[PDB]
Design a protein around this ligand. Structure first.
Ligand SMILES: NCCc1c[nH]c2ccccc12
Ligand SMILES: [Ca+2]
Length: 223
């Protein structure tokens, strides 16, 4: 997260870190046994880390739980990043508490102008590299479909939205991939892609979770 703020320990209790020997992606806990992330975060040997603030220090609220199964969206296209969503089942259920909590799926798609909270442990710089150890937050609005399409001609599908600032300076970035965009206490987006980070006229692009609720619910019901 470029241009964000330190969230504060366990203020974003649905935020997960996906760990393969190191943090590589974010995710959201949607019930005690399931995580949603980006399909571009897929790899084998995932440990889900819940209750994290500092990802390099054991602080006391963590739960570390191996993935048993990963399900990439059947229509994920790695070239276009259309359908950039995946589900991860935990080997055992998480213990839910005030610091580890699931985030609701949306009943409705959020409109342009809605203010959302984006969070992650990604890069905090738009050029060069500085990775924070503690969770970073950004408040950002959903942009109009027309702004988003103007910024990324020919690249925006009905399964994507833009959020952030056309002036630049504030965005998700490398390592934030798969993390949540939460609006009005519902998961609306997943950190998916962009042209660099925090560039002028190049806002972040997010997976539009409201299009995937039936797939998520039917997949969880049968796995
Ligand atoms: N808005 C940030 C999108 C993002 C995801 N993964 C990245 C890797 C490099 C640069 C940007 C990104
Ligand atoms: Ca920790």
């Amino acid at each position: 997260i470029v241009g964000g703020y330190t969230c504060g320990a366990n203020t974003v209790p649905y935020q997960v870190s996906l760990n393969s020997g190191y943090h590589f992606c974010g995710g959201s806990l949607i019930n005690s046994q399931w995580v949603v992330s980006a399909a571009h975060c897929y790899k084998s040997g995932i440990q889900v880390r819940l209750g994290e603030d500092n990802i390099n220090v054991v602080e006391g609220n963590e739960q570390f739980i191996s993935a048993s199964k990963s399900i990439v969206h059947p229509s994920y296209n790695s070239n276009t990043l259309n359908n950039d969503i995946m589900l991860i089942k935990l080997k055992s259920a998480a213990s839910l508490n005030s610091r580890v909590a699931s985030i609701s799926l949306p009943t409705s798609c959020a409109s342009a102008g809605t203010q959302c909270l984006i969070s992650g442990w990604g890069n905090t710089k738009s050029s060069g590299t500085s990775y924070p150890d503690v969770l970073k937050c950004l408040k950002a609005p959903i942009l109009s479909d027309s702004s988003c399409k103007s910024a990324y001609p020919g690249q925006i599908t009905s399964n994507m939205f833009c959020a952030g600032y056309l002036e630049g300076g504030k965005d998700s970035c490398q390592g934030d991939s798969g993390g949540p965009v939460v609006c009005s206490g519902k998961l609306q987006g997943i950190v998916s892609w962009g042209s660099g980070c925090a560039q002028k006229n190049k806002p972040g692009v997010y997976t539009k979770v409201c299009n995937y609720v039936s797939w998520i619910k039917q997949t969880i019901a049968s796995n």
